Amino acid sequence: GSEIFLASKRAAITYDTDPATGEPRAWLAPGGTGNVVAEQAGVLNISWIASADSEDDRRASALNPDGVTMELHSGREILVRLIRHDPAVFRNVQNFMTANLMWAANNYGWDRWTQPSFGSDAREGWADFGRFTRDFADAILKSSAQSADPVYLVHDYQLVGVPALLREQRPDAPILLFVHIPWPSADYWRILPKEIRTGILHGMLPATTIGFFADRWCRNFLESVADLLPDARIDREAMTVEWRGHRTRLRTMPLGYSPLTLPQLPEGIEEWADGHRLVVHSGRTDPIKNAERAVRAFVLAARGGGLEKTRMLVRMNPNRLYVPANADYVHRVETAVAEANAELGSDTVRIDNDNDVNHTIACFRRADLLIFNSTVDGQNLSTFEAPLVNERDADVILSETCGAAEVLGEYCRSVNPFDLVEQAEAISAALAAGPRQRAEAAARRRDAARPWTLEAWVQAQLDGLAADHAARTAT
């Protein structure tokens, strides 16, 4: 008897002609939070509320106020309702400063000794955060104006301010906030300026349920609350916060993959890899993906002997390259690859860069060894998808700091992503292992990965939120 409203900020939508119909088409770039949320919209048969961040988006939204019919990579179709944030007030929706600070904080990118140093920009950014949060919350509230019993599913870190605003207007509504990124240790969270470190928590706590992909993130969130909000009472065993009349439950809801989204190799790759064992590292152009260290670990593994007919493919998916840290990462990866080739012989290691899902899947299929060695990762879905499609009983080296390691770590070669020697030794061992050992390990790994579907995760959201809503009422 409830209507469900699902929102997230980022929607990477292209507009082109549909070859099937010859009509103008909206389609969603693959990967990122957007693809996950869009698939959830499809599972639930509801619209996806997200931000218009271009004239094209505004134009599409104005012509289709009921929503734009959008095509997923999985071929599936949903309605997307893009919020037409006023272009004169919100000049650049694509990049919000406060959200970018939260990205760096939550993914641990600062050394503290030299960075960060917050100036007036952080104050201005926080004011802008407030304006955007209000504009977004108002759009959700307008969308749900004809609903007597709305259920709000608010997705990802850009919307951390939203639950407080929804709770103010809809005191009895079930509200889930689901964060797709890590939550950092209390000492690290409090690097942020006082108004932001506390303000964000004030924005989140009015949610019925706060979800993360991993237990570690829930624990770190609770510790952050205990550290900063003298008014709050945490219960580490119950995973609860009680604060200013808000009761909040923290839940872990792991996600692995979408079965319905699971081709030929990129140009030149099949011939280059022929007769060689192939090590594959795959991920976005983001320093957390840790390809530089993966390449250096490969070089150290080769130094120990036994990798004579082995090559390494670094698959990088271009994304937000305008961010200085991302550009720096690509530079550092290119440098390590050049050093590897200088040391091991030309063409031992190759970078292959695009956002083509078919190429990604092909590379997952061809791999003799898969490396997902993130410095940290909210979850990392590639580490579920890859073994599920791999045909060669490839081993998987998985960083212990990926959310996914809580589910898959015991079925992979779990590593410290900062230790090049451990990683080199894991690379050597994985490639030395005989086919029967690898076959049995891969079968167990597929069995461990298989249950963690997008639909199961959506069900977890609803089951958790429903239970927490009941508990909130009883208290």
Residues of each annotated binding site:
156, 180, 284, 289, 315, 319-320, 355-356, 360, 377-382, 385
Interface residue with Mg ion, options 7, 30, 42, 53 (CB under 5 A): 53
What residues contact residue 217 under an 8 Å CB cut-off, 6+ apart? Answer: 179, 182, 183, 252, 378, 403
Q: Please choose, out of 21-29, 149-157, 399-407, 445-453, the segment that lies near Mg ion by the rule CB under 5 A.
A: 399-407
With CB cut-offs between 5 and 8 Å by kind, which of a second copy, Mg ion, none does residue 146 bind? none
- Indicate the pairing of strand 369-372 with strand 349-353: unpaired
Least separation in angstroms between residue 250's CB and a second copy is: 17
- Residues making up the annotated binding site for GDP-valienol are 156, 284, 289, 315, 319-320, 355-356, 360, 381-382, 385
Between CA 454 and CA 47, with CA 85 as vertex, the angle to 5 degrees is 30
Other C-beta atoms lying within 10 Å of the C-beta of residue 443: 12
Q: What are phi and psi of 131, to 5 degrees?
A: -65, -45
Sheet holding 233-235, edge to edge: 13-17, 24-28, 68-71, 77-83, 48-51, 3-8, 150-155, 175-178, 209-212, 246-252, 240-243, 233-235
Kindly state the smallest distance separating residue 162's Cβ from a second copy, in Å: 25
Residue 322 interacting partner from Mg ion, a second copy, none (CB closer than 5 to 8 Å by kind):
none
Cβ 1 to Mg ion, closest distance in Å?
34
Is the peptide bond preceding residue 324 cis, with omega within 30 degrees of 0? no
3-state SS, residue 284:
strand
Contact residues: a second copy, CB under 8 A: 108-120, 122-123, 184-188, 190-194, 216, 220, 236, 287-288, 293, 296, 300, 325, 328-329, 332, 375-376, 400-401, 416, 418-422
Q: Is 276 exposed, middle or buried (0-12, 13-18, 19+ CB in 10 A)?
A: middle
* Amino acid (1-letter code) at residue 27: W
Question: Which of 151/291 has CB closer to Mg ion?
Answer: 291
**Which of 85, 246, 251, 284 is the binder for Mg ion (CB under 5 A)?**
284
Q: Please, what is the minimum distance in Å from the beta carbon of residue 127 to a second copy? A: 13
Residue with tokens 């996914």: 404
67: partner contacted, choices a second copy, Mg ion, none (Cβ within 5-8 A by kind): none
Report the binding-site residues for validamine 7-phosphate.
Answer: 180, 377-380
C-alpha–C-alpha distance, residues 426 and 421, integer Å: 8
For residue 191, the partner it binds in Mg ion, a second copy, none, with Cβ less than 5 to 8 A by kind, is: a second copy
Binding site for Mg ion (CB under 5 A): 13, 53-54, 57, 97, 185, 187-188, 214, 216, 281, 283-284, 291, 314, 316, 406
